[PDB]
Each structure stands twice: as C-alpha cells, then as structure tokens.
C-alpha cells in the first residue's frame, strides 16, 4: 500500500541487547508507557491478555471507551449493560479492585441522569490497580522488551531518504510545503521545507524553532500535528498532518457570492475557536489568524496550519511585537503595546466577518489600498455590516472586534467559553464538535489542485515525534505485521539473549 519493497528490512527489529542503553534511561511511568504511547498501550494490553484476570480490566476499559462515545438517549441502556457485566455482586466479569463504595456512588449518579464522565472514579481506581504489580510485571516481560525495540526504531536517524516528495501544496515567504510519503510505511504527510539560506538572511530562526516546538507539544484536532523534524544540506523540514482540501481563502473567494452561508461559517468559526482554545491552554498566542492559515482536510474539517508567528508567553506576562498580516493585526499590535492572548480574538472576529461578507472588515476584496491606510481604518473606524449578517453574526463580530483589548469578548475569566456561549453558536454542540463527531456542512472536491547556525540546526532536527510515529506504525499495519513473537511459547531470535 505504497510501502517500499524493503520495508521489513528498513524496520527490522534490533537485537534486544542493543536496547541495553535505552532500558537504563527510560522513565518507567505507567500512564506514559501503557496508555499515552500507543504502541506501549497495545503491548501492555497484549501482556494482560496472557494473565488470567487482567483481560477483565481491559474489557471494562474498552466498554467505558464505547460508553464515552455513546449518545445521551442510549447512555442509560449502555450504563446499565456495563453495570451488570462488570460491577454488581452478581456480574459475570466482576472487577474487585473498584471499590463497592465507588460502585455505590456511581449507581446513585446513574439513577439520577447519566453523566458522560460517569466512570471517572472507576477508571481512575482501575488504573491505580494496573500501575502496581501488573505494570511492574509487564516490565519483566517479553512485551516490554519488545516495546524497547520499537523505541529503538522510533529513534533512528531521519533524513530526506526516509521520504518521497510529491506535489506542491502551498507556498510562503520562507519556503514551500509538498505532499510527502514515508517510504517504509506509505503514510502521507505534508513536508514544510524551509531553505536555510532564507532563514539566515531573514533572521527567521526564532520563528522556525518556535513553530517546530509548538507543533511538537500541541496536540489538538484543530491544529496540524508534527510527526518529524529534520535537516538536509540546504533545508529544515517539518513533516505535518496532510491537509488536502484547500485553504479558507480559496473557499471563501471561489464563487459568485464570495462569502459562505451562515451555517458553514458558524461551523468553521467554532472549530477555529476550539483550535484557539487548545493553543491558549498552553499559553501560546497565535498572532496570525487569517484565511490562508486555515486548511481543510479530506472530510472538510479545518486546522490551524501555520505557526511561524506563534509564541509561548510565560505565565503572568505580556509580550511586545508588531507582527502579523496587514488587515489582520489587532489595534494593540498595531500600536506596539504589550499584549497577551487578545489579538487572536481580534483575528477570529476578522475571520468570521470575512467568511460571511467575503472581504476583510477594513479592506475591500481586491481593493488597491495601502498598508498605512488599512492600519488607520483598524484604529479609527468602525466596520460596517451588510444585509448578509444575522443579528447574532453582527453581535459576535462587534464583540470580538472591540478595539480595547481588555474589554473584548474572549479576554475575560471564561476565556473561550464566553465566545462559545454567544447566541451565534446557540445551535452548536461543542462537546461533540471537540470529539470529532459532528459532520461538517461541506466536503471538498478531491478533483481540485489549488557557527551559531549549527546549534540552531541540532535543536531543530530532533527526528521522530514519539506518539505520532507510533500511531503511524499502527495505522499502516507495520505494527501488526512486524509485531510477531517466537512460536509455541518461545522467544524469537531478535529476543533471545544467548544469540
Ligand atoms: C498555511 C500556509 C501555507 C501552507 O500551505 N502550509 C501548509 C501547512 C501544513 C499542511 N499540510 N497539508 C498541506 C499543508 C500546507 C503556506 C506556506 C508554505 C510554506 C511556508 F514556509 C510558509 C511560511 O513561510 N510560513 C511562515 C513561517 C515563517 C517562519 C517559519 C515558519 N513559517 C507558508 N502559506 C501560508 O500563508 N500559509
């Protein structure tokens, strides 16, 4: 399925003794090793399936997975099924390490009205059990041994020969993004290639590193994810979630009637709002919200896709910096004031207005107007609203485009939640949107085609990102095919240490 012919050789396990060094120097943390890291999760689960009794605790955990995705109308029926499979005195798969005391509390919260995070405490205590003896036993096992081999692979050098590069997907001041493919696994990504020459000439180091490190640590369904970072002779590359559906600028202006139906604009706004929330949760200010930085995936969901201008603000501090794009810079930025998260709500106002109207609020579409004058309109004029806005669209745009940062919607104690409560979004179910369970109102046509250096370079090129790399191995069935053990209760050669 797009894999090279030698992929099994490329991904050949190392012998287990070559992982001696890893064994000594890996934090032996349950949540990370048996839940968060996806290959570690599967291996810990495999191990459990060989110990009489533990497959109950995992079956239960899967049953709750299914519950947390179950709708409200059927939350009761499913809650009752789980109760009489796993938790009662008489249940067939009784789990004893969840208190009867907690069973009691949970029955009472149940018979009232089922609350999506109902088994909050029961899942917790289950993990409290699994992290003791079972986990420590897992560490003794063949199955962790195998995890270390997977980890070994995860850390192998990444170079341009790990990938193949195809069509250009997008372009910018500092380089271009192409569709690329991992040779060994066939998985598709987008490779953002930044010429070393341009970075140095423009002193773009900070921006490049900021972007890499922020994409590395953010994990949001509304922001492109980072899977690899590496260097070539002439470039620095980021391998990112592939977004094949075009950017919002294109979609806005690709019609008689530039501008969307409110339904659709609402929807994008909500997803972008969530994206902003995820970044703010980490104290990142984005600073460059504009339609060309939002892209669609194949299903019509969006992600914030460029973070060159984003920056981490230490807790309890403000930053200075007159950066951004003309027409999308907030007054406090244009005035070179110190600011925090506020400019992003300004940008969100700009995006909603433009999605509805088909034009920046301070700038006609294809209007010959100079930077100086746009900046002037941003600071000195109020924006106008046409017949195209419902009252609630108008309301939210004005509230987000309040010139004073301190008084602007989204910049109070509730943060983003205040924006989610605005009537404009009165129909939108955010919990489901945040869980990826709302279908978008438009699916894109797949038929369209739209010295101090060296130090910086080593900090940039860290290789594979652990969790994305493991998901890749699973998703592409490299895990399933290669994760084989010795036959009939023995060790495979890669695991024998007499070798
Ligand atoms: C979103 C976006 C570009 C883009 O297409 N990015 C992109 C990102 C992830 C992706 N996955 N699938 C397609 C895809 C496309 C495109 C672009 C492409 C390559 C670039 F290098 C830049 C670019 O220069 N961005 C600014 C920057 C400055 C400093 C450090 C890093 N970045 C912009 N132009 C733009 O204004 N925004």
Q: Which of 299, 302, 303, 248 has the alpha carbon at shortest distance from 443?
A: 299
What are the distances in angstroms from CA 88 to CA 65, 107, 342?
A: 19, 10, 51
Residues 1 and 7: their CA atoms lie apart, in Å, by 11
Look at the domain 157-242+451-464 and name its fold: Phosphorylase Kinase; domain 1 (3.30.200)
Experimental technique behind these coordinates: X-ray
Q: Is 464 in the pocket of ligand 1 (CB under 6 A)?
A: no
Q: What is the CA(393)–ligand 1 centre distance, in A?
A: 29
Residues 6+ apart with CB under 8 A from 37: 466, 467, 470
The residue from 145, 247, 278, 288 that is catalytic is 288
Q: Which helix (H) or strand (E) holds 169?
A: strand 163-171
Q: Is the CB of 361 under 6 A from ligand 1?
A: no
Q: Which residues pair with 223 in a beta bridge?
A: 304
Phi and psi torsions of 178, nearest 5°: -125, 155
State phi, psi for 354 to the nearest 5 degrees: -60, -35
- Looking at the DSSP bridge assignments, the partners of residue 179 are 190
* 455 has catalytic annotation: no
Tokens standing for 297?
A: 């995936």
> At CA 243, angle to CA 241 and CA 244, rounded to 5?
140
Backbone phi and psi for residue 384, each to the nearest 5 degrees, phi listed first = -105, 150
Residue 347 CA to ligand 1 center (angstroms) comes to 18
Give the residue, by CA position, lying nearest to ligand 1 atom 3: 170
Supply the DSSP string of 403-467, one letter for each residue: SSGGGSTT-STTTHHHHHTSGGGTT--HHHHHTT-SPPS----TT----HHHHHHHHH--EE-HH
Consult the annotation and say whether 175 binds a ligand: yes
Q: What share of the chain is helix, strand, coil (3-state, %, to 5)?
A: 45, 10, 40
CATH superfamily ID and name for 243-450: Transferase(Phosphotransferase) domain 1 (1.10.510.10)
H or E stretch covering 208: helix 205-217
- State the Cα–Cα distance between residues 182 and 475, nearest whole angstrom: 13
User: How does DSSP classify residue 476?
Assistant: T
Q: Which residues contact 238 (CB under 8 A, 6 or more apart)?
A: 191, 192, 194, 211, 212, 215, 226, 228, 229
- For ligand 1, say whether the CB of 174 is within 6 Å of any of its atoms: yes
Q: Which stretch of DSSP H or E encloses residue 347?
A: helix 342-357
Match 């699916």 to its residue by tokens: 443
Residue 99 falls in which region: left (phi positive, over 0), alpha (psi -120 to 50) or beta: beta
Number of the ligand 1 atom closest to the C-alpha atom of 243: 12
Q: Which two tokens stand for residue 411?
A: 């910049």
Residue where the block lists tokens 């970075």: 199
- Per the DSSP assignment, residues forming a β-bridge with 231 are 236
Query: Where are the domain boundaries for CATH 1.10.510.10 in the chain?
Result: 243-450
C-alpha 187 to ligand 1 mean position (Å):
20
**CA gap 499, 489 in Å, rounded:** 18
Domain with CATH 3.30.200.20 in the chain: 157-242+451-464
Q: What span, in angstroms and rounded, lies between the C-alpha atoms of 103 and 118?
A: 11
Going by CA atoms, what residue is nearest to atom 9 of ligand 1? Answer: 305
| Annotation: CATH topology of 1-156+465-499 | Regulator of G-protein Signalling 4; domain 2 (1.10.167)
Judge contact between 468 and 226, C-beta under 8 A: yes
Q: Where in the chain is the domain with CATH 1.10.167.10?
A: 1-156+465-499
The single residue listed with the structure tokens 């951004």 is: 324
Ligand 1 mean position to 206 CA, how many Å?
A: 16
CA distance 466 to 456: 21
Q: Which residues pair with 139 in a beta bridge?
A: none
């Amino acid at each position: 399925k797009g894999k090279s012919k030698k992929w099994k050789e490329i991904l050949k396990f190392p012998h287990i003794n070559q992982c001696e060094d890893l064994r000594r120097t890996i934090d032996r943390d349950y949540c990370s090793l048996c839940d968060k890291q996806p290959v570690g999760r599967l291996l810990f689960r495999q191990f459990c399936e060989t110990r009489p009794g533990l497959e109950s605790y995992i079956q239960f955990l899967d049953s709750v997975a299914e519950y947390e995705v179950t709708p409200d109308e059927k939350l009761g029926e499913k809650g009752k099924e789980i109760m009489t499979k796993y938790l009662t005195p008489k249940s067939p798969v009784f789990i004893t390490q969840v208190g009867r005391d907690l069973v009691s509390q949970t029955e009472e919260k149940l018979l009232q009205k089922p609350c999506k995070e109902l088994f909050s405490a029961c899942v917790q205590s289950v993990h409290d059990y699994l992290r003791g003896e079972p986990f420590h036993e897992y560490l003794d096992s063949m199955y962790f041994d195998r995890f270390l081999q997977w980890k070994w692979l995860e850390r192998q050098p990444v170079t341009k020969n790990t990938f193949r590069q195809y069509r250009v997907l997008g372009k910018g001041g500092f380089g271009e993004v192409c569709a690329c493919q991992v040779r060994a696994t066939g998985k598709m990504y987008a490779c953002k290639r930044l010429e070393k020459k341009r970075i140095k000439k423009r002193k773009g180091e900070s921006m490049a590193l900021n972007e890499k490190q922020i994409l590395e640590k953010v994990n949001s369904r509304f922001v492109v994810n980072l899977a690899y970072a590496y260097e070539t002779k002439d470039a620095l590359c980021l391998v990112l979630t592939i977004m094949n559906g075009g950017d919002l600028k294109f979609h806005i202006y690709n019609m008689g009637n530039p501008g969307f139906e409110e339904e659709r604009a609402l929807f994008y706004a909500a997803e972008i709002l969530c994206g902003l929330e995820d970044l703010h949760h980490e104290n990142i200010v984005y600073r460059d919200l504009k339609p060309e930085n939002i892209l669609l995936d194949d299903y019509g969901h969006i992600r914030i896709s460029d973070l060159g201008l984003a920056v981490k603000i230490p807790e309890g501090d403000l930053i200075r910096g007159r950066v951004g794009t003309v027409g999308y810079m907030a007054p406090e930025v244009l005035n070179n004031q110190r600011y925090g998260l506020s400019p992003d709500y300004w940008g969100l106002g700009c995006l909603i207005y433009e999605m509805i109207e088909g034009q920046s609020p301070f700038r006609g579409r294809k209007e010959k107007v100079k930077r100086e004058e746009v900046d002037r309109r941003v600071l000195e004029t109020e924006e106008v609203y046409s017949h195209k806005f419902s009252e609630e669209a108008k309301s939210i745009c004005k509230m987000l485009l309040t010139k004073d940062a301190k008084q602007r919607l989204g910049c109070q104690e509730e943060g983003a939640a205040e924006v989610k409560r605005h009537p404009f979004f009165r129909n939108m179910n955010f919990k489901r949107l945040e869980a990826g369970m709302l279908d978008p109102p438009f699916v894109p046509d797949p038929r369209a085609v739209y010295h101090t250096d060296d130090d910086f370079y080593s900090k940039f090129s860290t290789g594979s990102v652990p969790i994305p790399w493991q998901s890749e191995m699973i998703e592409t069935e490299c895990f399933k095919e290669l994760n084989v053990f010795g036959p009939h209760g023995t060790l495979s050669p890669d695991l024998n240490r007499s070798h």
